[PDB]
């Protein structure tokens, strides 16, 4: 589907109504599987971190580690299809310009590729941007073939503010997710019992990001 039909007929109205929007079959099986292959090669050649320290045991051989990450620009060798994914995310956001809230999105982060190793670890409940750092939209792409949450867990559970219910999103192959990054969407990753990959990009609102630079004042200018 053109980034445009999807953006204008589904993503824009969904984000303004619900703030949480799922697109399945974003890139297709061939491109999705190539991204999966690039991510697995990154993992298998040791490009990820060792994982979030979960239990700091007295003996370190007993330390439990969780989600592993790596930051990907998209131009690295063997990340070209990841870069294609990122360009496709950018195309979608660009076709939403001036329709996502009142936000104006001119910049994003690099991609954070995450691997939950499948050892029962998840990710605690949190808000992506609780303190106004500029991030207004969180975009996650999943690449887990035939994921069965009843068996492997790993559901993303979101707790939409003001609503007495949560929204459970399975980390399905070739699924793209958008949600507001601020306190509207506290969320958690339930324990994952199989290897679980995701690629996240955050989009900045230009105003919020510009004034965030005041708080984090960071390179300066010489006086004398
Ligand atoms: O993977 C998912 O479905 C959702 N993941 C996250 O919400 C998530 N959020 C943050 Cl802020 C981090 C931050 C660092 C590493 C992994 C993260 C993560 O998986
Ligand atoms: Mn998060």
Author numbering: 188 to 404, 407 to 413
Paper text:
Using biochemical and structural studies, we identified four more residues in α3 and α3-βI loop regions (PHD2/Ile280, Arg281, Ile292 and Gly294 that are substituted in PHD3/Val102, Leu103, Val114 and Glu116, respectively) and which play roles in determining selectivity. Indeed, we found that FG2216 (IOX3)35, used in clinical trials for treatment of anaemia, preferentially displaces NODD over CODD from PHD2.
The ferrous iron and 2-oxoglutarate (2OG)-dependent HIF prolyl hydroxylases (PHDs/EGLNs) catalyse trans-4-prolyl hydroxylations on HIFα subunits, thus promoting their binding to the von Hippel–Lindau protein (VHL), a targeting component of a ubiquitin E3 ligase, and signalling for HIFα degradation under normoxic conditions. The PHD-catalysed hydroxylations of HIF-1α/HIF-2α in higher animals occur in amino- and carboxy-terminal oxygen-dependent degradation domains (NODD and CODD). The three human PHDs exhibit different NODD/CODD selectivities, with PHD3 being substantially more selective for CODD than PHD1/2 (refs 16). Biophysical analyses employing crystallography and NMR reveal that the molecular basis of PHD isoform and variant selectivity involves enzyme–substrate interactions involving β2/β3 loop residues (that bind the LXXLAP motif) and helices α3 and α4, regions which display sequence variations between the PHD isoforms.
